[PDB]
């Protein structure tokens, strides 16, 4: 194991889609749940896989405050997404913050969070660590329009077979 | 040696985003910084890397639970300092 600078050290963000996981908004939701008592946690990584399905979620409670947490300034959308699913609407009251049922992170622009922030395009995935020098990085690393889909959620009791955001309905 | 009759949770294909140009005012903007890079599953590297990513998320969550930083954790120096301390 050879390390020369800190620049040789790469944190790659891999997606759940690339590991044969169904990332429709109805199948992704059920991997997410709210809870109280655990705080957000963020981490930086250096590059990321171009994801297939990303999410831009803006669901609010019948009061009006947005369920998810207002992102810090350094939170930007996922750079390379092929499809973005705008989930938007009105959902019954729910306390706490939405985390992952798998232990995976919500990948942002070079930031991985344990919770999703309102107004920001994220993908689901994980972080790997690999160490490589320039001679080998030159051979291991060889040197876009998004499709927007729109969904809404309806306020009321969720069914037992449903994501945290409830049943989602695609619209125009 | 490696055959897709073996892998079942890995897509073997992987593309990633990674004169006066170094000056902030003259460099790329925040949506023009990333170059597309292609990574081949030459020695089953792509599926090892998906596997690594999937495996690291227990160490990573545990570590992020250890810490009280509520802004953004920096992992690079962490990895380095433990490299230098392992020897």
């Amino acid at each position: 194991g050879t390390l020369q600078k800190t620049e040789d050290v790469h944190l790659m963000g891999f997606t759940l889609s690339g590991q044969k996981v169904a990332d429709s908004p109805l199948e992704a939701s059920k991997r997410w749940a709210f809870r109280t008592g655990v705080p957000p946690k963020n981490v930086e990584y250096t590059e990321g896989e171009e994801a297939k399905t990303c999410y831009n979620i803006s669901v609010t409670d019948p009061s009006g405050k947005s369920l998810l947490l207002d992102p810090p300034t350094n939170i930007r959308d996922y750079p390379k997404c092929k499809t973005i699913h705008h989930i938007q609407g009105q959902n019954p009251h729910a306390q706490g913050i939405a985390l992952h049922l798998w232990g995976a992170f919500f990948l942002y622009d070079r930031i991985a969070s344990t919770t999703m922030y309102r107004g920001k395009v994220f993908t689901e995935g994980n972080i790997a660590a690999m160490i490589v020098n320039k001679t080998v990085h030159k051979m291991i690393f060889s040197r876009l329009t998004s499709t927007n889909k729109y969904w809404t959620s309806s306020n009321g009791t969720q069914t037992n077979d449903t994501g945290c955001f409830g049943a989602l309905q695609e619209y125009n | 040696a490696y055959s897709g009759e073996n892998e079942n949770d890995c897509d073997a294909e992987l593309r990633i985003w990674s004169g006066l140009s170094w000056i902030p005012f003259f460099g790329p903007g925040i949506e023009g910084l990333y170059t597309a890079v292609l990574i081949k599953n030459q020695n089953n590297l792509v599926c090892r890397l998906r596997r690594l990513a999937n495996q690291t998320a227990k160490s990573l969550e545990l570590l992020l639970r250890v810490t009280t930083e509520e802004r953004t954790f920096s992992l690079i120096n962490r990895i380095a300092i433990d490299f230098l301390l392992t020897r």
């Epitope: 889609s17 060889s142 | 897709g4 073997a12 294909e13 089953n44």
Partner: antibody, heavy 119, light 107 residues
Amino acid sequence: EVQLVESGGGLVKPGGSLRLSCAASGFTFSSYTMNWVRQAPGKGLEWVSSISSSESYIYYVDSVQGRFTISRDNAKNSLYLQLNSLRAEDTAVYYCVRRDNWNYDTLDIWGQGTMVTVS
Amino acid sequence: DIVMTQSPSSLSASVGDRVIITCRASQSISTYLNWYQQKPGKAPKLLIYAASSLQSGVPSRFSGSESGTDFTLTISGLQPEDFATYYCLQSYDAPLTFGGGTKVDIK
């Protein structure tokens, strides 16, 4: 025995749709990247599309970009190619080809092919 | 798009002859080149891959070598069944591209 079988090709009027199928056998279809290559009468081979196992990398040859749509259903071990706004230059025999992602992404399993005529 | 230039477009040869077919890339594609052999009315068959490796079930008359962007197909001893149209295909980035071909006739 690993085999790919093409069907769903016929005679179509210039300016309408035609849907091709493929049905894998013998190998794990969900683990491999699938391609479509056509050969126009008396011309050479021509790669047209590829879809990756997880369906996350999708590629087309710009002659057909926006016109054709590739997809797959991994449970059915089936590969599909929807051909839209068909042209006089789209007359070609189409194969479904498996790309082996662990032997340097080589196209090794071809089908017998199906003929698509746009007259 | 990566371009592929196969040479010549046609070649005349006899049985037992040595045949040299060349293949040139616009950019550098490493060793991600394959060679095919197609007969009229038949699906193309994979002979060389990784620019030099031999596909199971292919005789050892066919052989591939790489020198930068330049690649070579080589059939040192021709059988009466080795008259067919060959192509090189780059398997590196997409769109994947095939050469023009090479028609090997009887001399």
